[PDB]
């Protein structure tokens, strides 16, 4: 009762099993005292007691979970780490009852904020996939990784069997495809999430889990299999999956340099040779303009939509994969998952109908058996297609080469056609680059640095951070001086289009020009659109408009439009 | 009564957050201040989600225990000056109100209630109607108007705070040797500072911040704001003042200085307000006026 053991006395487990040794009163009191002495005393090399700092921030956020690193607990008082690995279900009870004392030492009357605190363990030093688990692991702490396949809704659950409740949720976990051996199906397990951990993860995420491995009797399993076979579940204890001023100053430094736009475009899709215009359009779409709206029933996208007609094998799928890896959030082929992200289409009636509604609106609506509901799309669409069989025909307008309605071509911001042209020098350049990249990728630190810096002019990590920063921070505006010139150019383009008998230019083209100019301003972190932005946007839209036309109309347009497509 | 901005309306958290004294004491314009407020509420034993509830609906137990909770905790944050005594009035079943809240409601109603010479005449005429919109609120039969006044007061303080943070973070205060200068060239909506009373509220905010930021150099301050319709700056000269808890009073000397420069200056200026410490001057003439002012020994 009164007397206590030494830490050296705990070196000898004296009972017949671990659990029957931890649960004894004197042993338990000794463990409680030692854990409290560890929590109040552990230090960084700089002093600077980490857990005093963490308990301080626990109250700053009104939180409920204290986090403890396993390596720290193993660095001193190792036997407690061993006992924790062997008997988590007891050790964590004692540890939580110590953590409440430690937190009340900082914040007296924190019991009125939350009645109970949970300790979360981190950096457990051994890992299994869902293959290696065996019966020996039962009731032991384990660390597991996989993809979350399915998720239930959150419910309350009775805590004690006056009443109290807690939150509850179950998650299905599956082996990551990269880990599965060849020629085998993936395995599955199910995880139980309790009070603080519910809705920590979403379906499709790749997740890492620490918890107890546990089992129970099930009548149906025994009935169907005909052997005394128990079912097993994992009870999670913890689950796992910004910038400084220095980054901001570096961004501003590179943006202050001339030609940053060209360098960003050059960095786009390093592995793919040529096709600069496609890279330009993709970069413009990834940055985008600013979404705007006007009472009196008008609205303007920030998102820039792009469509690309590819001859067979002209690098379309590779750039789409590159954009998938580059972009923050995206969908590859479901518009709900693309919210404020990029939507990617590589090939192509109900799907087209859905896309018609998606391009017409920015929100999707549906009804079923009396139910009515609405959803948001709010995304940039990049699409690619094969031009009506084996090969594009340049003698004909765009409509002959596609299976699309006119409003699709009307509502997309940028349209372009890519073709496998014949040239000895271009072929030699392509072949040399291809074999050079092939050798550079062969499986057989300095090598990586040389390889990286030769690959691109900008480190793509910095570019991705730059894109995220620009998208979150920069929101450019037009300057009112030169817009008289833009109106005159618009009128002139309409007049010339009518004069040759072309399909006319429209307000959609003007709106796209302004939005693309905002994107050019955003790319250099400029809050002001400038004359050169408008010039570049005009060139892009006019060239795209010219590419859609028949050959004679094309020649007349380019002869007249020379002061826009080339000059300004 | 507590020197907390409208305690018995909105919520306790908003009462601390927008208090003019608390901003000076804990530096709420940056995250390292706001975390102190979160830390205080954590130590006091008040759940943070209940602190943000409307003060009428907040739980009765916290209401009656609040008087003792402050005695144990405000010392650790150097914030003991919050406690004081004041007057409170109640009529029937409709609930209490203190004078300190009443005057804020009245001033809000005065401020926001609903070529060049004609526009100035229209503006000054509009400001006169608010006198009657406040006069009718001194009647117990018209509490409806008083509630509207309180609703306007909250928005006014919100807008003032959102401008003060922008002034401090961008460091627009220019530290001249004799006095501190600040000029607002642009803002989210600079029209609110065209009225004198709103401008003086912003000045009082900045004066508390400057008073507590450093022990040294109690200096006069000058604050100005442009108007795009007149192309004139509205300028005000403000004194320092000593902290609350601390002996003759000081006197504002900007009146004689502005009068002398006005008598001397080429500049196109106006002086007709009863408080002579506030003047107006055209866009191009601000810099020569201030140059002659700082050159003068009258400051």
């Amino acid at each position: 009762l009164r007397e206590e053991l030494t830490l050296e006395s705990l070196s000898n487990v004296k009972a017949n099993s671990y659990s029957e040794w931890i649960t004894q009163p004197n042993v338990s009191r000794t463990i409680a005292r030692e854990l409290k002495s560890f929590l109040l005393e552990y230090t960084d090399e700089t002093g600077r007691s980490v857990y005093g700092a963490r308990i301080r921030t626990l109250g700053e956020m009104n939180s409920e979970s204290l986090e403890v690193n396993y390596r720290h607990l193993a660095e001193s008082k190792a036997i407690l780490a061993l006992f924790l690995a062997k008997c988590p279900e007891e050790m964590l009870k004692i540890f939580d009852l110590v953590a409440m004392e430690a937190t009340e030492l900082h914040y007296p009357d924190y019991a009125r904020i939350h009645s109970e605190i949970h300790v979360r363990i981190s950096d457990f030093p051994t890992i299994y996939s869902l293959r290696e688990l065996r019966e020996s692991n039962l009731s032991s702490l384990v660390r597991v990784t996989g993809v979350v396949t399915r998720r239930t809704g959150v419910f309350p659950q009775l805590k004690y069997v006056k009443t109290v409740y807690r939150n509850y949720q179950r998650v299905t976990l599956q082996e990551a495809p990269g880990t599965v051996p060849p020629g085998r199906l993936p395995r599955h397990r199910e995880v139980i999430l309790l009070a603080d951990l519910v809705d920590v993860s979403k379906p499709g995420e790749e997740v890492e889990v620490t918890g107890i491995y546990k089992n129970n009797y099930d009548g149906n399993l025994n009935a169907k299999n005909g052997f005394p076979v128990f079912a097993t579940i994992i009870e999670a204890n913890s689950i796992k999956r910004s910038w400084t001023e220095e980054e901001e100053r570096e961004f501003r430094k590179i943006s202050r340099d001339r030609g940053i736009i060209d360098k960003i475009i050059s960095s786009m899709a390093p592995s793919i040779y040529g096709h600069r215009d496609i890279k330009t359009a993709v970069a413009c779409s990834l940055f985008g303009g600013v979404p705007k709206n006007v009472n009196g029933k008008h609205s303007i996208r920030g998102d820039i939509n792009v469509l690309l007609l590819g001859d067979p094998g002209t690098a379309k799928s590779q750039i789409l994969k590159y954009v998938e890896k580059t972009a923050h959030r995206a969908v590859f082929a479901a518009l709900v998952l693309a919210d404020k992200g990029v939507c990617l289409i590589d090939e192509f009636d109900q799907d087209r109908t859905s896309i018609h509604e998606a391009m017409e609106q920015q929100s999707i609506s549906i009804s079923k058996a009396g139910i009515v509901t609405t959803l948001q799309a709010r995304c940039s669409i990049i699409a690619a297609a094969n031009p009506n069989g084996g090969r594009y025909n340049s003698t004909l307008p765009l409509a002959q080469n596609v299976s699309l309605t006119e409003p699709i071509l009307s509502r997309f911001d940028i349209l372009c056609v890519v073709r496998d042209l014949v040239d000895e020098e271009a072929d030699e350049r392509l072949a040399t680059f291809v074999v050079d990249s092939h050798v550079r990728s062969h499986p057989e630190l300095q090598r990586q640095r040389k390889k990286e810096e030769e690959i691109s002019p900008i480190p793509q990590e910095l570019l991705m951070k730059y894109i995220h920063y620009a998208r979150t921070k920069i929101y450019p505006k037009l300057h009112q001086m030169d817009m008289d010139k833009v109106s005159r150019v618009y009128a002139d383009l309409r007049r010339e289009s009518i004069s040759t008998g072309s399909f006319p230019i429209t307000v959609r083209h003007l709106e796209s020009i302004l939005r693309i100019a905002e994107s050019f301003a955003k790319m250099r972190l400029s809050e002001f659109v400038s004359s050169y932005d408008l010039d570049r946007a005009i060139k892009v839209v006019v060239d795209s408009f010219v590419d859609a036309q028949k050959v004679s109309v094309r020649r007349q347009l380019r002869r007249s439009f020379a002061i826009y497509t080339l000059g300004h | 009564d507590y020197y907390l901005f409208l305690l018995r309306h909105s919520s306790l958290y908003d009462s601390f957050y927008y208090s003019n004294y608390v901003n000076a004491k804990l530096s709420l314009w940056n995250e390292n201040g706001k975390k102190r407020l979160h830390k205080m509420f954590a130590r006091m034993g008040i759940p943070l989600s209940t602190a943000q509830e409307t003060w009428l609906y907040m739980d009765h137990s916290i209401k009656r225990e609040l008087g003792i909770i402050f005695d144990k905790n405000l010392d650790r944050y150097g914030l003991q000056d919050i406690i004081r005594d004041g007057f409170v009035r109640t009529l029937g079943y409709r609930g209490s109100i203190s004078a300190s809240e009443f005057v804020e409601a009245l001033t809000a109603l005065l401020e926001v209630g609903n070529n060049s010479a004609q526009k100035l005449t229209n503006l000054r005429k509009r400001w006169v109607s608010n006198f009657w919109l406040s006069w009718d609120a001194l009647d117990d039969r018209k509490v409806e108007l008083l509630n509207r006044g309180i609703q306007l007061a909250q928005d006014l303080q919100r807008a003032i705070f959102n401008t003060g943070v922008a002034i401090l973070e961008k460091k627009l205060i220019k530290h001249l040797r004799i006095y501190r200068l600040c000029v607002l060239q642009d803002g989210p909506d600079l029209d609110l500072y065209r009225n004198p009373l709103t401008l003086l509220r912003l000045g009082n905010w900045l004066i508390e911040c400057c008073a507590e930021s450093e022990d040294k150099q109690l200096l006069p301050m000058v604050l100005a704001s442009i108007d795009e319709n007149t192309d004139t700056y509205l300028v005000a000269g403000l004194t320092p003042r000593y902290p609350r808890g601390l002996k003759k009073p000081i006197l504002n000397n900007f009146s004689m200085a502005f009068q002398q420069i006005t008598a001397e200056t080429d500049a196109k200026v106006r002086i007709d307000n009863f408080e002579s410490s506030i003047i107006e001057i055209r866009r191009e003439d601000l810099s020569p006026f201030l140059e002659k002012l700082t050159l003068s020994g009258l400051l």
């Binding site: 109040l40 005393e41 600077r48 007691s49 005093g52 301080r56 030492l105 | 650790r76």
Partner: peptide, 17 residues
Amino acid sequence: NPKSSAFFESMVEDIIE
């Protein structure tokens, strides 16, 4: 106790800062 002084120092820094 001197060994646990860092913990209380982290506590007391809220008073100081």
